């Protein structure tokens, strides 16, 4: 299933559940989210949310950064959505000719 | 093989000269380009107009079916 790693930090089951609820935005596209993996970590300037996810049509790899950790998580999602919507529709572009 | 070189003197305004005007028409019925008639800009305009009058009188055709 979905795995969450908190590198050199400690987090609560509540925060892990928030991440799972935010990753659920990707379920919109109705494609298989295969072993999604979120890495959470703290730089000196703020938090870093990493993610690697494979789908039937490719991989999603994105990194979000921000002072506020929930915002870094959201920036991660925004980058992941635009990658997934690309994987799902790019092949449609050259139907003609 | 330019059409104008295949003809002596002719009047570019004789809309009834069926036997001369008809050479300036492709086998499909169209007005031939200047590259295949050898006329300058000024006289190709007179030719085109004359062909059109002759078409309206029924002397020249507007279109012909292409035979292989």
């Amino acid at each position: 299933t979905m795995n969450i790693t908190s590198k050199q930090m400690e987090i609560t089951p509540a925060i892990r559940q928030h991440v799972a609820d935010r990753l659920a935005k990707l379920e919109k596209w109705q494609t298989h989210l295969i072993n999604p993996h979120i890495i959470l970590s703290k730089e000196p300037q703020g938090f870093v949310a990493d993610a690697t996810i494979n789908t039937p049509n490719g991989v999603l790899v994105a990194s979000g950064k921000h002072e506020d950790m929930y915002t870094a998580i959201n920036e991660l999602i925004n980058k992941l959505e635009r990658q997934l919507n690309k994987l799902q529709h790019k092949g449609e572009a050259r139907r003609a000719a | 093989a330019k059409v104008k070189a295949t003809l002596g003197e002719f009047d570019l305004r004789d809309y009834r000269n069926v036997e001369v005007l008809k050479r300036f028409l492709s086998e499909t019925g169209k007005i031939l380009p200047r590259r295949r008639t050898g006329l300058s800009a000024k006289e190709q305009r007179i030719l085109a107009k004359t062909i059109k009058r002759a078409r309206i009188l029924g002397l020249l055709p507007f279109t012909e079916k292409l035979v292989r």
């Binding site: 449609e92 050259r94 139907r95 003609a96 000719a97 | -």
Partner: protein
């Protein structure tokens, strides 16, 4: 590969009929590099062919090869927004390779317990126009004919 074509490996003839095609058949039977076993299964079947049907193993084996060679096949290709089964002619190298592959694969589908029995019997049936192998060649050919209307995409 990208740069050039590939060179077809020449195989040494086998040591019971001097045949290069018989060699390629042995190798296709060979699992885990057990060539001694691979050769023994073929030849063991060459006796079974002789003893169930009094004629040439070599001749039976070779005819069954021609009976599995597919003359045309379908080769996919995406055209705009649809995957089309383009009908395509098969190079003789590939014809041979497909023939030998399907022979063994279809033989190993059989219910007979000992392998050399399965290799013999399948080559017996295929020599006559039967068996799951020749079916596979027919199936592939019917696919190509069914799609003759796409034969102008051929590359």
């Amino acid at each position: 590969a990208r740069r050039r074509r590939a060179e077809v490996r020449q195989l040494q003839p086998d040591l019971v009929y001097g045949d290069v095609l018989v060699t390629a058949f042995i190798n296709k039977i060979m699992r885990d590099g057990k060539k001694n076993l691979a050769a023994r299964i073929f030849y063991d079947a060459c006796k079974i062919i002789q003893e169930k049907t009094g004629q040439e193993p070599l001749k039976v084996f070779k005819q069954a090869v021609e009976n599995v060679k597919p003359r045309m096949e379908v080769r996919s290709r995406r055209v705009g927004g649809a995957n089309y089964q383009v009908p395509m002619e098969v190079s003789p190298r590939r014809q041979q390779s497909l023939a030998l592959r399907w022979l063994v694969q279809a033989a190993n589908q059989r219910p007979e317990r000992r392998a050399a029995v399965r290799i013999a019997h399948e080559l017996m049936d295929a020599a006559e126009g039967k068996g799951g192998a020749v079916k596979k060649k027919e199936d592939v050919e019917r696919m190509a004919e069914a799609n003759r209307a796409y034969a102008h995409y051929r590359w």
